[PDB]
Design a protein around this ligand. Structure first.
Ligand SMILES: [Cu+2]
Ligand SMILES: [Cu+2]
Ligand code: NA
Ligand code: NA
Ligand SMILES: [Zn+2]
Ligand SMILES: [Zn+2]
Lengths: 308, 308
């Protein structure tokens, strides 16, 4: 059994987003829209329900941990259910939460060389946190092969490269490198059950589709319904392609892609505040359910039991 | 009229604290303790109820803004009630929230030279956020005199120096300098109403008592009931004096000090998770109320109407 807990299911900014009055955010605040608030994307993984691996440390981490009881096993006066953190990139929304964990150092943190470079230079979290009881202990994610985190010895992680886009603060922002961005395959080696996790997914190719067909659960980028969603809502000018996100709708969209995977469990995660699928009464939401695709929500638990 | 809104009333870590199973934190989670959760210390000030100055940007800022409706005036598709941020020190718990505001840059940020040095070097928030539409626009807090923020032109800020203790990540951690730590006097120049704000207060002297006697509301360090509180709860070894905090109880404690100020409104803020005053049924809480001292809570509104 692999336990996957959705701590946060929104894209950057969360839902509602602090400075946003789009249709969804304003409708949420007014009480006129049927929607549920979401913190910034992060999931926790376990092979036993007791030891957890956090994937991305969001700025909402305090509330996220507080809402999931196994994050506080209360085995001692100080304790936590977090046994390691895996980072998929060096973006502020995926790393800031580490600052809120500093009173529990040392923490084992798995990330690529490129992400470690960003996090020792432009956003020097490793340097800062070194001053708190040993700080973050870096474990290198290599750009080939797999890794196993000892706290959950039955989970085998095999990252896969995604298109590189170092964050705006990065010393190599204008020189993308392999290792800037990864998705994860995670296998419970007791059962062969496999999660394909790609909360940021801007393109699909043959290689990727092959990997997905081997998985049991697809937990994938649900950021925007349309490539120009930000512009349509009037709250931004960047396009899905500009942000590395394949929209759900249209030719080559993720719904078209997911049509190829009838057997797999399919869940959209990392959903932007603008995305109509957040409106529980929308026709876009209705269409996702018709297609057998689920929309992740904070607190969602996914049990991956066996391989198909 | 000066409006003071308590966005967060806890000390670092909040209440409950993510990794803490002390009497209070565990009692809160178990449902056996009558206490209310608190985010990390931050207040917002206004002379008009519409334009706000944030004092410290906590890591809980997203939830804090969401809970206080005037932070989202909805005057445009993107908007915020934050018109400036004042920082009293460079500590992680008082600055991290700026990262969550980057999609709303530029922001006017007031802080001392020493805090700007820390925030361009050891925790380089100004450098990072420069890449988001102009980033943070630094306004220097001088170590003498007063300042006025144009968005709230009737509020006159006069900082006062406190004992210097740069944070553990600071390049000058072992060489404290004037400007590392400040408290604030804030006056509504329309009425003469004065707030004395010292959420971190490790020592009192004659000069400080004189300033306090001129104020109408004292909003002061409520971190620990006893100097060795961390040790008594078994969740730490640092003492109040080691953290720059005067405890409430005992000789020279803040309650003894506050006994000298019968006329002023008196409110404890920045309360640690360990502090018995968080337990609404505790005798420590009962004693604070007997003394006419209030315990701040998230959402508390204070109206400072007039000078005594
Ligand atoms: Cu994100
Ligand atoms: Cu604090
Ligand atoms: Na399994
Ligand atoms: Na006033
Ligand atoms: Zn919105
Ligand atoms: Zn506690």
């Amino acid at each position: 059994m692999m336990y996957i807990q959705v701590l946060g299911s929104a894209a950057g900014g969360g839902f509602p987003q602090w400075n946003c009055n789009c249709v969804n955010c304003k409708g949420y605040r007014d009480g006129t829209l049927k929607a549920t608030a979401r913190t910034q994307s992060s999931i926790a993984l376990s092979d036993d329900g007791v030891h957890w691996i956090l994937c991305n440390a969001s700025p909402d981490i305090r509330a996220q941990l507080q809402a999931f009881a196994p994050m506080q096993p209360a085995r001692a006066l100080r304790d936590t259910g977090i046994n390691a953190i895996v980072l998929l990139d060096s973006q502020i929304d995926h790393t800031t939460g580490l600052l809120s964990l500093r009173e529990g150092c040392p923490h084992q943190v798995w990330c690529t060389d490129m992400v470690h470079q960003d996090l020792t230079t432009g956003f020097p979290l490793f340097n800062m946190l070194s001053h708190w009881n040993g700080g973050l202990q870096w474990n290198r994610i290599e750009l080939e092969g797999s890794f196993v985190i000892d706290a959950c010895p039955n989970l085998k992680f095999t990252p896969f490269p995604l298109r590189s886009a170092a964050p705006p603060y990065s010393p190599h922002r204008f020189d993308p490198h392999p290792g800037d961005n990864l998705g994860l395959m995670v296998e419970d080696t007791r059962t062969g059950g496999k999660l394909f996790y790609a909360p940021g997914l801007g393109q699909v190719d043959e290689k990727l589709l092959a990997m997905m067909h081997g998985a049991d659960c697809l937990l994938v980028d649900g950021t925007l319904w349309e490539d120009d969603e930000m512009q349509r809502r009037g709250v931004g000018t960047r396009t899905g392609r500009e942000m590395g996100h394949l929209a759900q709708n249209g030719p080559g969209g993720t719904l078209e892609v997911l049509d190829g995977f009838p057997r797999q469990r399919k869940v959209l995660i990392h959903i932007n505040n603008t995305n109509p699928i957040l409106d529980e009464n929308s026709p876009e939401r209705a269409e996702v359910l018709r297609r057998g695709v689920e929309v992740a929500f904070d607190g969602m638990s996914i049990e991956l039991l066996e391989h198909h």
